[PDB]
Ligand binder design. Structure first.
Ligand code: GDP
Ligand code: GDP
Lengths: 339, 339
C-alpha cells in the first residue's frame, strides 16, 4: 500500500508539474523509486507486464509497436472484484475491457508517432487497480535496437539508448533486465546497459524470458543457481504466453496455471520451482521496492525544504507559474502526512 | 582452383609474413579475397563451419574456445579419400583423428591465452584437403560479445570489436553474417556491425541459423524470400547440430542428412530446400569467391609496386632480410602470372 504513496504522488504531478518548474522537476525523479523495465527488442518486456498484470492490454509487437514512456501503477483491491483502470490522459473516466484499453494505448501512441516508428519522449500515466495483483510502480521503456530498419530513422539506434539511459541514469528507479534465453547473456543489450549505470547491482534484477523454447541438452540453471551471470539479488525465471498462444487467444489467467505446471512439473527445475514465475516476481519486486521507498523518505526536509523557497519567499509570468509550481509540493506533504 | 592459389599463396606470406616490412604487409590483407566468418558469441559460426567441412574438429563455443583468428583453408582432392589436414603451426605433418586436430587447435590457443578466456592476435593456418569440401578460405573470427564475463578483465569486449572490424574493413574481404532466427534481426550484433563497414551490403552474405529452434508460432518465410531484411544476395539459413546432437556425438555425416529432410518436409520452407542446404552454402560461396578474385587480381600491381619499392633499396639485419621478402613476394606474382 506504501508503494501507492509514490503513485498517490506521482500522477498528481505529471498532472501539472510535468513542466520541469525551474525546480519542480525535482520529483518525478526522486519520487520515482519505481522499477524501470528495460529489454532490447523481442526481449519480452511487452509480455511480462501482462503476466504481472495477469491480463492483456499491450498492443502486441514481436518487432516494435510501443514507442513511448509508460508509467504503469498497479494496486490490489479489497477482494471485491472491481477491476478497471484509468489514465491521466483521459481524466475521471474508467475502462474495463482490457482488450480495448489495448487500443487506447495503441491510439495515444499514434497521436504523434506512427504505424512504423518515430520520436516521442513524454510519459503515459495509467493506473490499474485489480484484486489479484501486487501494489507497485513500473515504467515501460521501448525495446533496444542496433539495426535501424525500414522507414525508421538511424538515430532511433542511439535515440532509444538515449531514452533508456536517462530513465536509467536516475539513481532511484530499479533496473529490470529482461534478457531472453535462446541467446547468451554475454550479449544482453539489457545487461550491457544495465551495467553501464549501476556496475554495482544496487538496482537491477535479472528476468530472462523464454525457456520452453530454449535448446535441448541445454537448460537454464546456472543463473537461478546464479553461477554464470551472477546477479547481486538473484535471477527470476519466467514463462510467458508463447506466440503459439497469443494467436490462440489464450487468456492471461489460465496462462499462469501453465507456467506454474512448467517448473513444478519439469525435471530440470522441479527444485528451483518456487522462486520462479510471474505470480512470484511481483511479490518480490514490490517487496524490494518498498524497502527502497521507505529507506528513502527523508526526501522530506529534502521535500520539506523546497517549499519555503517559495510559499514564504515572494512580466509576472512566474507568479502565474508558481500558482501551479506549489500546489504540487503542498498536495505533496498531506499526501504523505496523512498515511 | 583460382581460389586454391590464394590459399597456396598466403600460407607462404605469413609463413614468415606475420611481421611484414612497414610498407608491404598489405599482402595477406592484399591477398585477402577470403571470407571472414563474423558472428556474435554463440550465433552459430563454429557449428556452421563444421557443416562446411563435413567433419567435427572444433573447440565447443557455449563458454567459447576459438578466440584465435583461425584462417581455415579447404582444398579439394580427387575421389581417393586421403582426407588428412596439415598446420603451418607445424610444417610437414598430417592429421586424421579429427578430434586430434580439435585437440591441437585448443592446445595452441592455450599457449596464447589461458582457459577462462583471454586475447591474442596471430592467426592459425589449419588447412584441410577432401572430396567433400569446396575450395574456400575462411578466417573464422572471435565471437562478438557485449558483456565482459567473470575473469575477462573488461577491455576484453571492445577489443574483440576492433579485431572483428579489422579483417573486415579490407575491401576484398567477404563477410559471413551469421545470425540466429530466435531473435529479431534488429538485434543482430552482426548485421549491425556489418552494415557498419559495408553500407553497400556488397560483400556480405546472409546466414540464418537455429530454425528448428524457432517458436511454434513464428518462422522465417519472410527473410528467406528476402522480403524482411533483404541483403543483395539470397539469404541462406541452416540447421547445424544442436547441443542435443553434439552429446550423442551425432556422427557429422549424419549432419546434412538431418536437415535435408527437415528443410524438405516442412511446408513453411518446403519449396526452398534445394537452394537452402548446408552443403549448398559452400558451393554458393566457393563459386562466389572465384569471381571476386578474377575481379581483383589486377592486385598484381600491388606487388610490382613493392618489388619496385625494394628492388631499389640501393648492422646488416634488414638488407640480407629484405631480399628474403622479394623472393617470397615477387615470385608469388610469377606464381600468379603462371595461372
Ligand atoms: N514461449 C514464449 N514466448 C515468449 C516468451 N517471452 C516472449 N515471447 C515471445 O516473444 C514475442 C514478443 O515478445 P514481446 O512480449 O513483444 O517482448 P518485446 O519484443 O521485447 O517487447 C512473442 O512471440 C512472445 O510470445 C516466453 O517466455 N515464452
Ligand atoms: N538446433 C540448432 N542448434 C544450433 C544451431 N546453430 C548452433 N546451435 C547450437 O548453438 C550453440 C552455440 O553454437 P556455436 O556454433 O557453438 O556458436 P558459435 O560457435 O559461437 O557461433 C550450441 O549449443 C549449438 O549446438 C542450429 O542451426 N540449430
Amino acid at each position: 500500500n506504501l508503494i501507492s504513496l509514490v503513485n498517490k504522488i506521482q500522477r498528481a504531478c505529471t498532472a501539472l508539474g510535468d513542466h520541469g518548474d525551474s525546480s519542480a522537476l525535482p520529483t518525478l525523479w526522486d519520487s520515482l523509486p519505481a522499477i524501470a523495465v528495460v529489454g532490447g527488442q523481442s526481449s519480452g518486456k511487452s509480455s511480462v507486464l501482462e503476466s504481472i498484470v495477469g491480463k492483456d492490454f499491450l498492443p502486441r509487437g514481436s518487432g516494435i509497436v510501443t514507442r513511448r514512456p509508460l508509467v504503469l501503477q498497479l494496486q490490489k483491491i479489497d477482494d471485491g472484484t472491481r477491476e478497471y483502470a484509468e489514465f491521466l490522459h483521459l481524466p475521471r473516466k474508467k475502462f474495463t475491457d482490457f482488450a480495448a484499453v489495448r487500443k487506447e494505448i495503441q491510439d495515444e501512441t499514434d497521436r504523434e508517432t506512427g504505424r512504423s516508428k518515430a520520436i516521442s519522449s513524454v510519459p503515459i500515466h495509467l493506473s490499474i487497480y485489480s484484486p489479484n495483483v501486487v501494489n507497485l510502480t513500473l515504467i515501460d521503456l521501448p525495446g533496444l535496437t542496433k539495426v535501424a530498419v525500414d522507414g525508421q530513422s538511424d538515430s532511433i539506434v542511439k535515440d532509444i539508448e538515449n531514452m533508456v539511459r536517462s530513465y536509467i541514469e536516475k539513481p532511484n528507479c530499479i533496473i529490470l533486465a529482461i534478457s531472453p534465453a535462446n541467446q547468451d547473456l554475454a550479449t544482453s543489450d539489457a545487461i550491457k546497459i544495465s551495467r553501464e549505470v549501476d556496475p554495482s547491482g544496487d538496482r537491477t534484477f535479472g528476468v530472462l524470458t523464454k525457456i520452453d523454447l530454449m535448446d535441448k541438452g541445454t537448460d537454464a540453471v546456472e543463473i537461478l543457481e546464479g553461477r554464470s551471470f551472477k546477479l547481486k539479488y538473484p535471477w527470476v525465471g519466467v514463462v510467458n504466453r508463447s506466440q503459439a498462444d497469443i494467436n490462440k487467444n489464450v487468456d492471461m489467467i489460465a496462462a499462469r496455471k501453465r507456467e506454474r505446471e512448467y517448473f513444478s512439473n519439469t525435471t530440470e527445475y522441479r527444485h528451483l520451482a518456487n522462486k520462479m514465475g510471474s505470480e512470484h516476481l511481483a511479490k518480490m519486486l514490490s517487496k524490494h521496492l518498498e524497502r527502497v521507498i521507505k529507506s528513502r523518505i527523508p526526501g522530506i526536509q529534502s521535500l520539506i525544504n523546497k517549499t519555503v523557497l517559495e510559499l514564504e519567499t515572494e512580466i509576472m509570468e512566474r507568479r502565474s507559474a508558481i500558482s501551479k509550481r506549489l500546489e504540487l509540493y503542498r498536495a505533496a506533504q498531506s499526501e504523505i502526512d496523512a498515511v
